[PDB]
Every structure is written in structure tokens, then in C-alpha cells.
Design a protein around this ligand. Structure first.
Ligand code: C3Z
Length: 207
């Protein structure tokens, strides 16, 4: 298991998200669904030139899986997936400029709901989750598990769990007072309100 420090601006953004009083927490789901949608567009675009890139799965979809026993909400996609490099430094480097602009916007009167306009919408997961686990599998690499409970660090390990073929799975270990995002009616309401025009099927699993 490898442990990494977040870049200073990312650690600062995650602390802001965890510490700021902000009741409109539900926007985390739109951000994660939007990220899943972008990765599905990426594999779809790549498959047009190289059809063999879909040999690890033709179906392009998003699954929302609540689990009251484990207190988790899992967002699963069959998108392009991430390499070890994407998890360790590639996406964290791009996120530095977006974090800075978002921080400036907040100081100028913007609110946490506009986070996605800065390409750092993923971190809104920490409005509701005490820990986030990300399992991913790209065609050119092995299966990896990224994990963080904030606090300035994240881990990356080769995933020994069940192979997922291709795509990304975001496991939100919810805070004790945020279990409403495990309720079927609540997830349905949020999906209809913020993610109604996503170009991929979104299946809300039931328990
Ligand atoms: O399909 C995903 C779902 C995601 N949800 N949230 C995260 C963010 C993230 C990154 C690193 C480590 C941890 C989280 C996603 C990332 C991916 C994904 C897979 C491949 N490209 N791509 C991606 C999508 C949008 C922006 C950047 C990359």
C-alpha cells in the first residue's frame, strides 16, 4: 500500500468542504454522475477509432448502489477507467488550477454548488462521506484502489478484490448523520432534480 500527500491546494479544498456550514449537501451526487458520464464519453470516443477497446465491456452505464448494512453509496460506471498514473499525480496536477479558481470564486460570493464548473466536483463527496474508496480499471493497466479519509493523504494499492472489467467504482462511506442518501426516494429525487439529462442509463439499485 502506497501513501501519498495531497497537493497543498487539494488538502485546503477538502478541509473547506468538510468544515464549511453548507446544508445543500445533495449536489455531491450530480458531481459524481457527471464524472462517470465524462469517462463514458471518453471510452465511447476511443472505441470509434479502436473497436477492441470495448473487449472489456460494451455496455456503457451508471449504477447507484446503496447499502444500509455497510453505510455506503456506490456509484459504478463502465467508463474508460484510470491508470495508476491518473490516480497518483496526473489528475491531482490538473486539479490545482481548478481548486485555486474555485477558492477565489468562493471568496467573491460563489457557493459550494458551483464546484463542478472548476473541474474539482469529485471533492464534494466529502460533504457526505467520511471516507471515499475508488476502484478503477483501465484497458492499459491493472485494477487499482485509491482511498482517502481526507486528513491530507490518500493511498493507492493494486486491487485484490473482484475484477470489474473496465470502469470506475466510487464507494462513499457515509457519515452517520448523512444516511438519507441511502434512501431510495431521496436518491430518486436528487437524480431527477440534477442529473435528468445524462446520456447513459442510471440504474438505482434497491436493497
Ligand atoms: O469514471 C470516473 C468516475 C469518477 N468519479 N469521481 C472521479 C474523480 C477521481 C479521480 C481520481 C481519484 C479519485 C476520484 C471519477 C473519475 C472517473 C474517470 C475514469 C476515467 N476517467 N475519469 C475521469 C472523469 C472525470 C474527470 C477526470 C477523470
Amino acid at each position: 500500500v502506497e501513501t501519498f500527500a495531497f497537493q497543498a491546494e487539494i488538502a485546503q479544498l477538502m478541509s473547506l468542504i468538510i468544515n464549511t456550514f453548507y446544508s445543500n449537501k445533495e449536489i455531491f451526487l450530480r458531481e459524481l454522475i457527471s464524472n462517470s458520464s465524462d469517462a463514458l464519453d471518453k471510452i465511447r470516443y476511443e472505441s470509434l477509432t479502436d473497436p477492441s477497446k470495448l473487449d472489456s465491456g460494451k455496455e456503457l452505464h451508471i449504477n447507484l448502489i446503496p447499502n444500509k448494512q455497510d453505510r455506503t453509496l456506490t456509484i459504478v460506471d463502465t467508463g474508460i477507467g484510470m491508470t495508476k498514473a491518473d490516480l497518483i499525480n496526473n489528475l491531482g496536477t490538473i486539479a490545482k488550477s481548478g481548486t485555486k479558481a474555485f477558492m477565489e470564486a468562493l471568496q467573491a460570493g460563489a457557493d459550494i454548488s458551483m464546484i463542478g464548473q472548476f473541474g474539482v466536483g469529485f471533492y464534494s463527496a466529502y460533504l457526505v462521506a467520511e471516507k471515499v474508496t475508488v476502484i478503477t480499471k483501465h484497458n492499459d493497466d491493472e485494477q487499482y484502489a485509491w482511498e482517502s479519509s481526507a486528513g491530507g493523504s490518500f493511498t493507492v494499492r493494486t486491487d485484490t478484490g473482484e475484477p470489474m472489467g473496465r470502469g470506475t467504482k466510487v464507494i462513499l462511506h457515509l457519515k452517520e448523520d448523512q444516511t438519507e442518501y441511502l434512501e431510495e426516494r431521496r436518491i430518486k429525487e436528487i437524480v431527477k432534480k440534477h442529473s435528468q439529462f445524462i446520456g447513459y442509463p442510471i440504474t438505482l439499485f434497491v436493497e
